[PDB]
Amino acid sequence: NCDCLNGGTCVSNKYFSNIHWCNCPKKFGGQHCEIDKSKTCYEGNGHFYRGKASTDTMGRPCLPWNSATVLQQTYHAHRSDALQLGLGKHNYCRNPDNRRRPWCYVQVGLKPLVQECMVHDCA
Amino acid sequence: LRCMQCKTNGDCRVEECALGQDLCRTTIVRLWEEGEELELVEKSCTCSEKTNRTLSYRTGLKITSLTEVVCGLDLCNQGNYLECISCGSSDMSCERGRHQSLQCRSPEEQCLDVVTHWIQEGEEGRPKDDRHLRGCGYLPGCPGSNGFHNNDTFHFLKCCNTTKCNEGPILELENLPQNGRQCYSCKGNSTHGCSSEETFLIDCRGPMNQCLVATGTHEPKNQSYMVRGCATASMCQHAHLGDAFSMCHIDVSCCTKSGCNHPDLDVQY
Numbered sequence A: 001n002c003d004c005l006n007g008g009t010c011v012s013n014k015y016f017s018n019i020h021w022c023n024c025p026k027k028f029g030g031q032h033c034e035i036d037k038s039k040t041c042y043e044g045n046g047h048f049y050r051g052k053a054s055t056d057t058m059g060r061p062c063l064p065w066n067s068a069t070v071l072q073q074t075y076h077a078h079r080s081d082a083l084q085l086g087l088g089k090h091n092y093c094r095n096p097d098n099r100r101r102p103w104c105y106v107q108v109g110l111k112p113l114v115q116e117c118m119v120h121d122c123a
Numbered sequence B: 001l002r003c004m005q006c007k008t009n010g011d012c013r014v015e016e017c018a019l020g021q022d023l024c025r026t027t028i029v030r031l032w033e034e035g036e037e038l039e040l041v042e043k044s045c046t047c048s049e050k051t052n053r054t055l056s057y058r059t060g061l062k063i064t065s066l067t068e069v070v071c072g073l074d075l076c077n078q079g080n081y082l083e084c085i086s087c088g089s090s091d092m093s094c095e096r097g098r099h100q101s102l103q104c105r106s107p108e109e110q111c112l113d114v115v116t117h118w119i120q121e122g123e124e125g126r127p128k129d130d131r132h133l134r135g136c137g138y139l140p141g142c143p144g145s146n147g148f149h150n151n152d153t154f155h156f157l158k159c160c161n162t163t164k165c166n167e168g169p170i171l172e173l174e175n176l177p178q179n180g181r182q183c184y185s186c187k188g189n190s191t192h193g194c195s196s197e198e199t200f201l202i203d204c205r206g207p208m209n210q211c212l213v214a215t216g217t218h219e220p221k222n223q224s225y226m227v228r229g230c231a232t233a234s235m236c237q238h239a240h241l242g243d244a245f246s247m248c249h250i251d252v253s254c255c256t257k258s259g260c261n262h263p264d265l266d267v268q269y
């Protein structure tokens, strides 16, 4: 019920429509303390990847999972499991569908496109 | 009325404002860490009697900024130099005397000290309210003080404009001398929280010398709340009490003689 993850006791305020948010740990970020600020490498499938990696293999930037276009696609930040998935308001390599390594949608010419991302794993 | 209902994630909607809703709200939480920041926004048909406002405070090097703003008509929520003391209970900077300076960035926002204190027990209940907060801002009724307490809550706000006008020691309830008035305490509904046998006499402390009865709705899901206790003069007006108890459409009554505000002295409906 109190949304957060990792460390992150959650906090609210009676004055402002009792809105709730997270007080976050040193190594964490995000609305819900979800983003992992430290972690460089990925951990396997890269499914549980959280850290903040923006670009991809060709050097191009990921579109934000909350962007108007990525909202057309199958994986976006408006979906019920978005928190669980690691899909926030950001452009970070993520592997929600259990593909090989983490990816993200990347604007190429006129269409969003999956692109295997940067970020080597531990190896 | 219909307002724009935006979830925190970005997801919007258009909300048909329900019976006696009558206000569009946009609430904004903006956090700034060292060079680092985010912001959350909700939007919704809200209770009337709300109003534009702001709160901001240092906790560590983090700086939290609340703001909420309201407007009359349809889909209006749709589009886009003063010094104060600052601290919170997140990092216990308030209780541990780590008070920091906070320059207000606005003409209208003044020094603030807020006390939200719930007694209760443990789990579900006791809102996540920081419970000690100090910094720049503008809030209901303002420059002034008001408070309420009863057997299980103490709310207090101190609003003023002079350099570090909000300094001082942490304000705890048992640090405030009995004032001599005694008023019934209870809080819930005639079934629970304020049935005859849960409502009982208590010792008003500090500036809260009026016996209070408030009836309203409990907008976090209805049920039509009641609240009895020791109020300051101020809280007895302009529905400041709603904010403490998150209530809507409150009728409050304030008698200045000890022990009035007994149940059977009530006006009602």
Ligand SMILES: *[C@@H]1O[C@H](CO)[C@@H](O[C@@H]2O[C@H](CO)[C@@H](O[C@H]3O[C@H](CO)[C@@H](O)[C@H](O)[C@@H]3O)[C@H](O)[C@H]2NC(C)=O)[C@H](O)[C@H]1NC(C)=O
Pocket: B050, B051, B052, B069, B070, B071, B072
């Ligand atoms: C909270 O603050 C808002 C003001 O900053 C305010 O919105 C004001 O609402 C009116 C309409 O009722 C707008 O009027 C506009 O119309 C007049 C001419 O009639 C112009 O002078 C203005 O330039 C403007 O176009 C205001 O624009 C609008 N102001 C803002 C900033 O949005 C809310 O109503 C306020 N709610 C409370 C409780 O104070």
Ligand SMILES: *[C@@H]1O[C@H](CO)[C@@H](O[C@@H]2O[C@H](CO)[C@@H](O)[C@H](O)[C@H]2NC(C)=O)[C@H](O)[C@H]1NC(C)=O
Pocket: B119, B151, B152, B198
């Ligand atoms: C009046 O307020 C006090 C708490 O300050 C309540 O008394 C305590 O009751 C709880 C649980 O019932 C005990 O665990 C505590 O030991 C008591 N603390 C003190 C300081 O006495 C009392 O329950 C209150 N009555 C209502 C209806 O809220």
Ligand SMILES: *[C@@H]1O[C@H](CO)[C@@H](O[C@@H]2O[C@H](CO)[C@@H](O)[C@H](O)[C@H]2NC(C)=O)[C@H](O)[C@H]1NC(C)=O
Pocket: B188, B189, B190, B191, B192, B223
């Ligand atoms: C008095 O208020 C309580 C809530 O404090 C109401 O409670 C509900 O009772 C139903 C079962 O009938 C439960 O499913 C809800 O979870 C309870 N909610 C709460 C908040 O307790 C109760 O119905 C109210 N009774 C009257 C007569 O108003």
